[PDB]
Design a protein around this nucleic acid. Sequence first.
RNA 1: UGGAGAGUUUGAUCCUGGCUCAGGACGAACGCUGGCGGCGUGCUUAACACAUGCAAGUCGAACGGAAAGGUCUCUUCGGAGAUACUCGAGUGGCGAACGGGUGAGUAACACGUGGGUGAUCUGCCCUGCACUUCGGGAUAAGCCUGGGAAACUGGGUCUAAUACCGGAUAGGACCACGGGAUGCAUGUCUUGUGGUGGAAAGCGCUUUAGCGGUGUGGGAUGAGCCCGCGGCCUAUCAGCUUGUUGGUGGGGUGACGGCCUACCAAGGCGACGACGGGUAGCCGGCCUGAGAGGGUGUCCGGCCACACUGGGACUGAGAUACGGCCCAGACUCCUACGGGAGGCAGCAGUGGGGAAUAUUGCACAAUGGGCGCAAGCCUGAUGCAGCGACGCCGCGUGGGGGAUGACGGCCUUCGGGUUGUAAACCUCUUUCACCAUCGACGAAGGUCCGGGUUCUCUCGGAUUGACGGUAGGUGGAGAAGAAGCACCGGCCAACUACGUGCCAGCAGCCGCGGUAAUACGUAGGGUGCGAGCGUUGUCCGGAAUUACUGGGCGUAAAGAGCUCGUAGGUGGUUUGUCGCGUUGUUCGUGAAAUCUCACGGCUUAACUGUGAGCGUGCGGGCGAUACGGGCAGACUAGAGU
Lengths: 85, 201, 82
Amino acid sequence: MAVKIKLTRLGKIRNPQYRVAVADARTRRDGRAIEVIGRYHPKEEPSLIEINSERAQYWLSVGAQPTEPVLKLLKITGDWQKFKG
Amino acid sequence: MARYTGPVTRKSRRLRTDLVGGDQAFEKRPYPPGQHGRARIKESEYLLQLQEKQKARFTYGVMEKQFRRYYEEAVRQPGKTGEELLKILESRLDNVIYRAGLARTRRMARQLVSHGHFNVNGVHVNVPSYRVSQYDIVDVRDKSLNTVPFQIARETAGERPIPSWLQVVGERQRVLIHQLPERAQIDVPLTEQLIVEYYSK
Amino acid sequence: KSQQKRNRTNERARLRNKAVKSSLRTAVRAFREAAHAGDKAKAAELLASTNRKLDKAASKGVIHKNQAANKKSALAQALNKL
RNA sequence: UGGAGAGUUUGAUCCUGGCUCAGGACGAACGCUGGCGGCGUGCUUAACACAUGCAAGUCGAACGGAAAGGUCUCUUCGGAGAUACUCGAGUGGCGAACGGGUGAGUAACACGUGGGUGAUCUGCCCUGCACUUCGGGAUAAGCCUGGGAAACUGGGUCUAAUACCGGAUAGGACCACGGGAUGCAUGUCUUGUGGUGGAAAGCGCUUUAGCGGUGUGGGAUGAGCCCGCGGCCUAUCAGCUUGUUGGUGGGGUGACGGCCUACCAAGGCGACGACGGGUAGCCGGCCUGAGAGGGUGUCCGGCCACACUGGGACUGAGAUACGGCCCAGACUCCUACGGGAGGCAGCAGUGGGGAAUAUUGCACAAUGGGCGCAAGCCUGAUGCAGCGACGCCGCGUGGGGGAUGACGGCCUUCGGGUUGUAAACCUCUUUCACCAUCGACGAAGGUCCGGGUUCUCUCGGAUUGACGGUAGGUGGAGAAGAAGCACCGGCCAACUACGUGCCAGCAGCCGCGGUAAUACGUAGGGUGCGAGCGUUGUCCGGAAUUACUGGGCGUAAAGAGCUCGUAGGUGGUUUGUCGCGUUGUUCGUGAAAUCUCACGGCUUAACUGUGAGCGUGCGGGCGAUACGGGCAGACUAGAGU
């Protein structure tokens, strides 16, 4: 039971978006997220990122473990690299 | 949830007024809707208000179930609900085209729109009921050229004075809305309050 | 189903655990007997083995050490009484 | 920027006060008809039983090991050599307690909300520190072997290990004494004294890139414990209570705790509803309503319980745990009859039940979860599809010309009217169906390339989109190809006649029909809505007919036969006080979604999305003290003597 960062599929069927959130691995796809930090869209803008990039450093400092796509988003923002720097 | 699709005389005479007309100014007939219509009739607020609601319904060609949606919106909005209803109805695509005079009848205007003869800013739309805002420019479909009802329609555009809240280019018929569609300030051929009260009872 | 290994290994674990626990309680019995007789020195030696047995098991995960705390602390006080 | 009423007692009126209707809503059944798309929902009845197939497997970078494919070698040329990529099977490690489903039971333990949780835990994550050593023995697997029909099992051989076991080779920490800094919140930090332990490992590999491993500090998560307040009916249940109430001591527990338990005391609850019965999963929220409130709590989301029935426990960081064991019991099944096996209230599916509720669908692309260094594996959850107009939203079912006052119908004062310019006919367009055709976003990842030692961040290419020829797009043909349903005395838009003749028959209330029915059957006419329309059923309102907002009790039903007086309620003038109540401020709280508003995106809408608002409400902290209230006290008219 460890805190991870998941991408929650929300909205309508064929044009959904992904809510960015910190959550325990033992939760469901749409559970009571600990705190939501931004959003993501797969359409319109190529890899549309809308991330606060403020608390990520905190939650990572606690030890939150993001998944693959989350790492990619963090790298596009530079938050992964800036945090690790 | 669909078009009336029938004779106009049955409702224009029932409501005792030529709602639109068409090629003929009006049927040049009396005021008995049907068989026994020549007899006098007793009035009610329900009859009267109902008739007024029907006048808007057929004037614009919208069915009840959608009309109540617009009603709901008008009630939600501040200002006189009737005036809000008319303005909302004026944002209708078919309405601004009809008021631009680009078709013999409103029915003709809606058919053309429903078949995409008049697109929008960038979309080949086919929705009579589309809400047209400020700077929501109509694009005349390129495929609609080499046909009748845009060139001949342009030539006959004078039959429908352009609403003061918008400007039609004519050369491109870029129906450009500048101000809000305050039809309440112009050419209102029927009541609104009676309708507003009617839907409350 | 094909997960009977879960059962078998549970059997081994519980078997050794409760065997150990019985041995612990046996030692406790001896200590308490030393308290009744008054052989404090023997009780001290047995308490030392208890220290090398009780916490040894706790380090093997038998308990979460709270039982060790209650038992060693309380009985050390009991020995302080006698 | 937010509430309408009518009909309905009498010869007539006015009041009082019942019935009904007009609206909306539904997880919806039925009827008639029936085009499409988009978006959503789909046992509400027997927590009744169940075939089929599938739902949790993974790790060779832990080890033994070689039952396969394939490799390499051998070589019988159809058998060998684990050499090894790989790997059946197996030991060991993770998880298997999440996830999925249902709501029987539960009457407040739960739920909600908010507080406490100083002797409440908290493995897998991050992080600082220290450790990261020395050894033994056995054994599964394998081989031989016994049993039984099978299930399934004994015995003997044989073997390693991040398995087991014993040495500390940490002394943070555990214990006790004493001490120091610092608590009232039943005490936290820190030093000394005595005792005092624990693991860990080694690994394969990129042949050292990496994987690791142990005790701790504190974080973080999650969970547990306790508690205030709130959220059904019943008094035709008022006496409930000896493990009960309280203490001592002891054990036990992750833990305070009659949790348990020896002894002692005799209490405790209760009309400011005990015990008991009935009914029920709770909430965010859904519906109604002007709102206050009512009803409801189905999908979705959170929380709680249950898993053929009942009971108990292990493993474990953490179980009531659908796919785990054991017992008991029921019900099915097998058998060599000896003896055994099973649990769809998980997806789909069957049967039953009933008015009724779906495909034995495709796949794991993204997302999601687990193991593993990773690649990779699994995933009937999520993601997509199929059925019903099952329900919302949205578009068509042609326009222009078009008095022939066509045909025809109906009525007719029978001259005429009406149907009706509607049709016929001329003309132009084609959304969508049909046909053809191109074929996406949703997509990042994986391989590979280049830059990059490992990393990083990146070039290019490859592949990977199940749903998919997807949709969308382009072109073609021609009004071709797609309108019905209910009602029509009034209430209530909505009628003329025929037939009929208290009969038949209609009806929500009044009610109609006793040979001239505007109320029955038919035609025609008209109205309303529209691939939906009507009926039934249910909830609200309308109903101010349970009335706080917002009603009554002289006769309309209603003032106890009267008095007393307990609890409870309520309580004059007033000083000063407390600031409990209330008010104002501030912090936290009040999740998200949903709702309002404003923007924005799906061709619009519905819908989704953004943001604000809303979140009416609690605690904490901050000022005043009016009024209320409490305390202290006074006067006097109240009342009394």
